[PDB]
Amino acid sequence: TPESKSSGVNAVTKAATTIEMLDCKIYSDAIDFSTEDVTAAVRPSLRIVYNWIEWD
Partner 1 sequence: MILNNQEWLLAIFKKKGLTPTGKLEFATIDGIDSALAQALNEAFDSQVVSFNDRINQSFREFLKRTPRDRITLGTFSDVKEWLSSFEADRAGRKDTASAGPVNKLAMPLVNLSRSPAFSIYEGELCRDNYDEGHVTNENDEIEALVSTIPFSLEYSLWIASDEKESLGMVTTALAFWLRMYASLGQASFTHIANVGGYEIPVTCYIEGQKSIAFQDLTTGTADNRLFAVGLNLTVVAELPILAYMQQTTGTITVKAKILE
Per-residue contact string for residues 31-50; x = within reach of partner 1 by CB under 8 A = ----xx-xx-x---------
Cβ partners under 8 Å of residue 35, min gap 6: none
22 binds, among a copy of itself, partner 1, none (CB under 5 to 8 A by kind): none
CA distance 19 to 50: 12
55 binds, among partner 1, a copy of itself, none (CB under 5 to 8 A by kind): a copy of itself
Nearer to a copy of itself, 6 or 56 (CB): 56
